[PDB]
Amino acid sequence: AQLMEVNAQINDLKAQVEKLTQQGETLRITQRNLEAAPITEVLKQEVDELRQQVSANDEKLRLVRESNAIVSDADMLTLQKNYKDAMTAWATRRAKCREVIDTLSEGMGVKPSAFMDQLGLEEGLPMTTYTEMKKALPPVNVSKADIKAALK
Amino acid sequence: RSQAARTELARLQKALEEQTNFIDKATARIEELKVGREETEERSSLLKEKLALQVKLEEQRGTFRDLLKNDPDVAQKLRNYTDIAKQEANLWTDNIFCLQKYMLTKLQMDKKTVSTALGITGEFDYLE
Questions:
Q1: Are the C-beta atoms of residues A140 and B82 closer than 8 Å to each other?
Q2: Quick check: helix, strand or coil at residue B71?
Q3: Of A28, A72, A130, B2, which shows the fewest CB atoms inside 10 Å?
Q4: Largest alpha-carbon pair distance within chain B?
Q5: For chains A and B, what is the number of CB pairs under 8 angstroms?
């Protein structure tokens, strides 16, 4: 019935509708993105609130730090090392002293005690407490470089 | 056959109207939404900050968590013990310098031999 006229038109618009629908959905996508974002006045708020909220923690850190309420990993290392240094310095200077006191005792053929009494050398503390101190709290070795690594 | 193929053209006209009105509603809603939200170097440099800060927080609370790991009772225990040991190390230092006095000015021993025997070194000092 020369329906080519009409059966062509369907094809024409079957192309047209499709175009708009495949364009249509695109709009939807972007508007979704638009509905999922805050305005630029509210986003300007939330930021100057977060700024204050962060600055807050910077102050809390400044305080608990300045008050020595807390110990940093580097500091906890440094005290730890300084301890080794002292307990070493101690156990060392005692020894390299009492070993000379040894020779010098029988040099004069006399007890070490009275030698220390004459020269005016101090009793010391006992090693009873030193070793029980190493026991209580064990010294450890701590590299200076380790301490630099903790400080960053 | 003819009308059967005529109906398929009656479906797509209605479909086109519906799709057209839909697109209209869409462009409208965007037109209203793009009002508050407007892409700018400002809003751009802004969203980035609402993230930056947001993250910096999580970093901070991590910092805290980690900072509290360190027992200050121990820090003090250490602090006290070392004070003790250093006063003791300073004691035996004083005893060593005293043996230097006697050995040098009484037993007239060797100023070279004395150092080496006592343990006196370069930069031998009290612990401050």
A1: no
A2: coil
A3: B2
A4: 138
A5: 190
d(CA A114, CA A120): 10
E strand or H helix that includes residue A29: helix A4-35
- Cα separation, A30 vs A33, in Å, equals 5
- Tell me how many domains chain B contains: 1
Experimental method: X-ray
- Per-residue DSSP letter, B107: S
Instruction: For an interface test with B, give the residue of A90, A99, A110, A127 to mutate (most B CBs within 10 A).
Output: A90
Reference A78, options A145, A134, A135, A136; nearest CA is: A145
Name the token pair of A21: 């629908």
Q: How far apart are CA A84 and CA A141, in angstroms?
A: 7
Q: Which residues of chain A neighbour B84 with C-beta distances below 8 Å?
A: 133
* Residue B118: count of CB within 10 angstroms of its CB: 20
In contact, B15 and A17? CB cutoff 8 Å: yes
Tokens 């070490």 label which residue? A112
Q: Determine what percent of chain B falls in helix, strand and coil, rounding each to the nearest 5.
A: 80, 0, 20
B10 interface with A at CB cutoff 8 Å: no
Three-class DSSP category at A113: helix
The SS3 call for residue A67 is coil
- Minimal CA–CA distance to A88: which of A123, A133, A121, A122? A133
Quote the domain boundaries for residue B73.
1-128
- Find the length of chain A: 152
Q: Are B59 and A61 in contact (CB under 8 A)?
A: no
Enter the resolution in angstroms: 3.2
In sequence order, which residues have a C-beta less than 8 Å from that of residue A91 and are 6 or more positions away?
A: A130
Q: Going by C-beta distance under 8 Å and a sequence separation of 6 or more, which residues neighbour residue A75?
A: B70, B75
